[PDB]
Amino acid sequence: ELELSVKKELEKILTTASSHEFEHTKKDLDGFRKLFHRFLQEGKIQRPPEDSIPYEKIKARGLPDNISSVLNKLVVVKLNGGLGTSMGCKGPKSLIGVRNENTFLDLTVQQIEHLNKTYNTDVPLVLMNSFNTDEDTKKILQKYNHCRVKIYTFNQSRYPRINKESYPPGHGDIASFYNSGLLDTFIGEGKEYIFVSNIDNLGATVDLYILNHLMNCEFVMEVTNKTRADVKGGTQYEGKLRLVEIAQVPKAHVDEFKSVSKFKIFNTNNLWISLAAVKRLQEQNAIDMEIIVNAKTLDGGLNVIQLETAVGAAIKSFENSLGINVPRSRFLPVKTTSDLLLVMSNLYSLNAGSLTMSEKREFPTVPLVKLGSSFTKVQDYLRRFESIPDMLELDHLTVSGDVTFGKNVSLKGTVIIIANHGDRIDIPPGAVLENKIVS
Amino acid sequence: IRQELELSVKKELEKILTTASSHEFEHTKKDLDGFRKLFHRFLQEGKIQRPPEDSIQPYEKIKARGLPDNISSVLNKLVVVKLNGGLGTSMGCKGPKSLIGVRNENTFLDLTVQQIEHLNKTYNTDVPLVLMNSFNTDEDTKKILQKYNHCRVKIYTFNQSRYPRINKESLLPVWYPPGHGDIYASFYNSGLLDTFIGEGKEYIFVSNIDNLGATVDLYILNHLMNPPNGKRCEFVMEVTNKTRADVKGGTLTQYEGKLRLVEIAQVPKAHVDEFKSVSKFKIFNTNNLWISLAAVKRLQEQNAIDMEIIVNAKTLDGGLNVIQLETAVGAAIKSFENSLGINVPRSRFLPVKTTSDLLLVMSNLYSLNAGSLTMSEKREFPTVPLVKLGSSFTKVQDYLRRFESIPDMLELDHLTVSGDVTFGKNVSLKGTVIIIANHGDRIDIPPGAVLENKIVS
Amino acid sequence: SQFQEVIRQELELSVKKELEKILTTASSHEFEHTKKDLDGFRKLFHRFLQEGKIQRPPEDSIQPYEKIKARGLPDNISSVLNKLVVVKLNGGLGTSMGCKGPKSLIGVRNENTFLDLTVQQIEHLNKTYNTDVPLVLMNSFNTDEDTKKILQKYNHCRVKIYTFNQSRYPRINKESLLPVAYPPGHGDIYASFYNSGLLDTFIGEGKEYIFVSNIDNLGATVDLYILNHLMNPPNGKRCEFVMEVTNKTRADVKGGTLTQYEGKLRLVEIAQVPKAHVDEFKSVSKFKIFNTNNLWISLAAVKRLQEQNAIDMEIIVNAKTLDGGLNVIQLETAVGAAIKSFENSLGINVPRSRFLPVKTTSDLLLVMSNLYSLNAGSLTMSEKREFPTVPLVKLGSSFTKVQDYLRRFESIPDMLELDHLTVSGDVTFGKNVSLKGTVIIIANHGDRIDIPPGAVLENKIVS
Amino acid sequence: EVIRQELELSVKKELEKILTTASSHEFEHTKKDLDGFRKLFHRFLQEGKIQRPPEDSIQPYEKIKARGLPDNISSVLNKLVVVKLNGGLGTSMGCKGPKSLIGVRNENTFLDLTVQQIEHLNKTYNTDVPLVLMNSFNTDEDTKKILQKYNHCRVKIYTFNQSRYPRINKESLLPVAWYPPGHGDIYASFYNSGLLDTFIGEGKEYIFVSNIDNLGATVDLYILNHLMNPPNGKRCEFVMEVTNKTRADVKGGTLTQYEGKLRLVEIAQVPKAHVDEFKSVSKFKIFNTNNLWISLAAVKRLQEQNAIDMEIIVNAKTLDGGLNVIQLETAVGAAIKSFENSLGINVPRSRFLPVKTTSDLLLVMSNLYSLNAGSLTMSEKREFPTVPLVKLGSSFTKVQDYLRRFESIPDMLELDHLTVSGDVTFGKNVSLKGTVIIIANHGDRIDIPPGAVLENKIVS
């Protein structure tokens, strides 16, 4: 008698519709009911064997020659649903400057343009944007016409927040793909596959070595070795491969997670998913994704629980799955302005829209940089540099305080600069900082 | 001309050779004439040689061949020689570097013999230890040896030669050790060479006492004593990958059928850029070498030991620029028939140059097993953490003063301190720690504190 | 006498009329109890206008708690509680501490508020004793309307919670002697509690004794031994009015003491003490006795004395200035000075287990440390804390407002081995700090100090 | 009047009890030095405005240059003698011994350079010009030691010492404690050394007195063409190089036509009232360079006559554990007034470039200037011709410090003002441009990064 009083106010929100909106109105609610019923009804015994999961072994099978073929039976979807307010800039996380002078969105059409103009193929790109991103990104999709690209944008369902005392439904909502109708469209043409990559990941290009094991199974989940850097994240139970998340872990076995190995598994969020298998699961309602609590409180109101599902959670529902190892070449997500300084450096070379780590960086290791609190805002980031320094021979960089960089600087080895509170530190142009502590 | 000003520097030492203290005469004549013998070669003083994939072998291919059975093995073919001719004033200490404490507190010397004991006291064998110490270190090291009686290890000493500090502007003499190439002649001349080959030992294993990871390894020894169907070995060179940590050293190449050594100075100007990547040079001179005893006798008799002349500048401290003619051990493989060096894990090369290495190596990051220490887990990534202590921390006494115990490091990646900083008991460093106390200020870090990804100003 | 008692009469006449004015002001149908309130002011005022040294206190009038504690506890049933009334003093906000609201609603431990811990205490009586103790709160216009909306949380519990408001009085002028168009303190209780129609309800329900304490005193708790002493008393005397007293620390010389004046007890406070002998009050101790404001009072006794106007309490002056205004007086009274009027009145000397005023954040810390343990809503110093010694904690002005206090300590540090603490300026503690010995943490203007998580500061001066 | 002769002959006998303590052979020079004083003290006891200097008596170097060069051969050099002023240490720069011996570039010492010059002269021209050094009791034996090194360079070198005088006391008026009596003491010493008669015997006719600070003191052919084979007939005798005043160099010496001849004037000689008009109004554009051209012939003629008129420079000095005392001296320039036909010629600042302090060094060992065969001249592309202004602090004063602070001399072509003070260091390959102020307050350090370009900046 305690779920029958929330649904009665979910019937009291249908008559507050603006007459026209009724097609996707009675449906988005009827999804919340399918997941609110799983809220109040809520191993270790199997470890992943050798016969399940390497990169350099597929390359020796290895590459189908040549045109195309095969490049024509595929669709490319990159995620959008997400602001970059954490970055600073109000608006979609797609519309921020990366390399002079392209943005995330620009970098993606750059990649597709090179393949179309060389393999004679026409591969359509797709955005899965949220309600906070569609108004803006739609207005700028006009500057992409007359480029050899097909474009297909569509929204995600709207979900009602609920209160602790008495929002986007996560990235796993891709429920929506059948709702817009493009599911039925894409299949009935010749395509058989969908490639999901995040837009934050800039290494997540479409691979031709993997397109061998795909073309001429079904479900591919890409993986990379865990590193001290990124500890928490997603990692074969009872026949099928099951996704395991940080929050699902019982109280006892927290020490067993992370340490040691044990596990090498990490969630890449780069997936290939078969089209014809979606309709065998989306219609019979057998997709089993796990739903997470995710209750924050911002800014000056009660604690709110926002229920969301995960993309990689539907392996337990898919049949005949197997994952393959992908070297860190093809995983490079950008989160803070400290990543921006990294990627826009002469650490990466730029080639037809997709970027790779450069020569001659002698050792193949990312030199990660920690920028201070006063660099977090992208508008402040560019203020303080403009003239992204030389970093081909840098190992560690840490700046904190009111610091400014002149043009053409070179950073080498370990550089530490720390201005005290209400001090300014002005690095002169052309300067070469090598293993130095600038207080 | 070049002779007529060389016969001056030869009759300039005839005045000091009569300034000889009766007995100490023949080991004085022997050296000074061996100084002339270098000075001569000093006046006269590729590339097509790309290194081969057959001589230089991976460790992984020896280690699993593999274990020599049984009793035992023989091992009684080996001699462990360790270089002990180095002062430790860069670490702060007046005297031999060997006598600096590393753990609990075993000294450098302590730790070696504790290995040789665990061998002999488990394999019913008698392996010797041989130290080469120069005139700097011989005195002080001898007095502190009486503590090793009734340890199952026979220990032997012999001195490096004594050459004159020649003048840059003057090219005339007024004292230094000729490096570590001097071994071949000074080890023969002591008499020890003939002893060991007389006991039937045929293989000597040189290394640096600095290299705490330089441990006697069975798997390699098996490749040597009773070798794989073939000939060899007159000489072996342990060699590791190049790290950003150490960009200048030696590289081993194949110039003219035999493998040569190349030093950074031997490089003419229009090719210095080329050395150390393009990465067709991931060879690093570890300085951990095996040699054959039988081999040394032959080649030393006929002066058939060819090394490149090292020419070091220093004017330090007060006075004119000084010229030190030296020779290295490596620069003499090309004069040994049939050479090959193998590739070795960095596990086997852990040299303790600064006070910053001490920290690393006496932390809970390494676990000790009576002498020989290893990178013991829990440790997640294999990566060696960066540690850079300031100038307030160089002299050992200061370093030891500053730490009231050595802080936990098993989950550290980078740590940099500078200033008058001072630690506590049970301190736990995790992530990237930066602690900097400015000219006049002092930071003392409270006991049992956990600094994790922080910056203390 | 001649020219002095004409002016005095014209003062009491002038105000009265400017108060006959502020009566119909005010022309609100809801008169209850306005006219009475203003008849209480003129009673105080008339006294203010018209307006030692004697003996030390006798050795049988004040008694040690151990003598009484060991007699010992009642036997039946008991069921001696059924003649008791607990009364908590809720006339006061926490704007001192810095909180929008009644002090009675700030959280202490895990994280129950002063009043939570109070009802948890009574619940636990009634539960283990199949008894029904009534709880009364004597609050003010400041405190009532706010707490009433919350009192519905204590539903389904085993308490009957009761309320009343004590009067409003208007604040008189220090220059002009004129009312501006305040709660007269805890001393007003007698009148207000009776007028509220509760004194009579309970007397006619079989109660005989009232236990008055503060809400700020987390230690002031119902004690079966001191209860045994009034209910079924020794010999048959028959008292009436009993006031808990303690021994004076350096911590509190500025309090009130009991002394025999002309044949009865009287509470003598800092203020009424002559200019020449102010020192001899503080020392020697000697006068080692100090008022706790834990009181036990007979209900029968109130009526007899109330309905007959005879509770003689000393008048306090209390000059205040706030905010952009000149000087205003304010007339108040104190429970304690009532002893004077009662009969067979006596005081018992108490441990300080029973006296913990949570007045500052300094006090809060201590009381949410590991230096105490919470059991059924009451808390007491806990073993193992070896030396019985009580630490002294002085926090800085940066720690005054509770909202700050919480954020500055990521956790509550381990105490138990504190002797002295003194923090002043901009500091901050992390998770799992352990403090022992004497800890001094001074940070100057413009500086920060962040004690890292897990630190153990023993006898250090951090700067 | 009668007291003066009393205090003048009291001095006579007091010195007479000091000869009686002279080491056998030292005497014949010690006495002549002491009779040198007798005369100066005698002048010192007995001790405008109409002076504004004419047109024709001071000439612009450009006219002279355009006449121009000697033809034969020349080999006009044969009649010249180069004299460089040595007496004078470099303790104010933070150096022991002779200032002559400080490293300027490569490092060539001050003296390394002037021989480097004379030599290149003799070698290109097949002539053998001599270098004579006038050092004093402080910079003599120290210099002679180093002279061994110039063997087998093509320069005959010489030395002589100027006199040594007694320090007389402020209150007492008695002598004590010895000093070299100014550079003006060149006429007397040069005569007594005998070189003067020696040289006028080998048929030399002229000396070129100049200073070893002066790096710009080139031997210039056009001035020579004017002295040997003079145009028109006359015939003079004394020539004073002379330049323009900068706000920099205002308090100097200027020529004026006092009573017939030219006469030098020093700020110390000017009446209190008129001090404002000397040192501007310019008016006095002329400023003394102390590069002089003098006839050997003429010296001798007038020295036998004791006719050389200099003014007494009265000096007050008391350092460090001494008491207040006077130190009577004379100036070389001062002597125009007694020579004949004397003229001054105005000369580019190129010829005038003294390195008196550590600021100056930085400037001269820059890439602003350029070095060839010992001589150095500013050069390209120093586009706007003006000389940049450098004020290093009291930290950079000592030569030994100055070098430790500059891990490399920095670029200065584009530099207009540089001013530092406090505890500062410089990386290598620094470039300075425009106006650069770097100021480090007591207790601080500024370390400039290598490769830095400071362009119009304040670094505090």
Curated annotation (Swiss-Prot), chain B:
The modification N6-acetyllysine is found at residue 395. The modification Phosphothreonine is found at residue 383. SUPFAM superfamilies: Nucleotide-diphospho-sugar transferases. GO terms for molecular function: D-glucose binding; identical protein binding; metal ion binding; pyrimidine ribonucleotide binding; UTP:glucose-1-phosphate uridylyltransferase activity. One of its GO terms (biological process) is brain development. The active site is at 353. One of its GO terms (cellular component) is cytosol. Changing residue 93 to S: No significant loss of activity. Its main location: cytoplasm. It is found in: Cytoplasm. Pathway: Glycan biosynthesis; glycogen biosynthesis. Changing residue 175 to S: No significant loss of activity. Substrate binds at residues 85-86, 180, 208-210, 287. The keyword Repressor does not apply. Highly expressed in various brain regions. Expressed in amygdala, anterior cingulate cortex, caudate, cerebellar hemisphere, cerebellum, cortex, frontal cortex, hippocampus, hypothalamus, nucleus accumbens, putamen, spinal cord and substantia nigra. Also widely expressed among other tissues, including liver, heart, placenta, lung, kidney, pancreas and skeletal muscle. Changing residue 379 to H: No significant loss of activity. The keyword Phosphoprotein applies. The modification Phosphoserine is found at residues 391, 405, 418. Its EC number is 2.7.7.9. Mg(2+) binds at residues 97, 210. It comes from the Eukaryota. Belongs to the UDPGP type 1 family. PANTHER family: PTHR43511. Homooctamer. It is linked to Developmental and epileptic encephalopathy 83: A form of epileptic encephalopathy, a heterogeneous group of severe early-onset epilepsies characterized by refractory seizures, neurodevelopmental impairment, and poor prognosis. Development is normal prior to seizure onset, after which cognitive and motor delays become apparent. DEE83 is an autosomal recessive form characterized by onset of frequent, intractable seizures in the first days to months of life. Affected individuals have profound developmental delay with no motor or language skill acquisition, and poor or absent visual tracking. This is UTP--glucose-1-phosphate uridylyltransferase. It comes from Homo sapiens. The gene is UGP2.
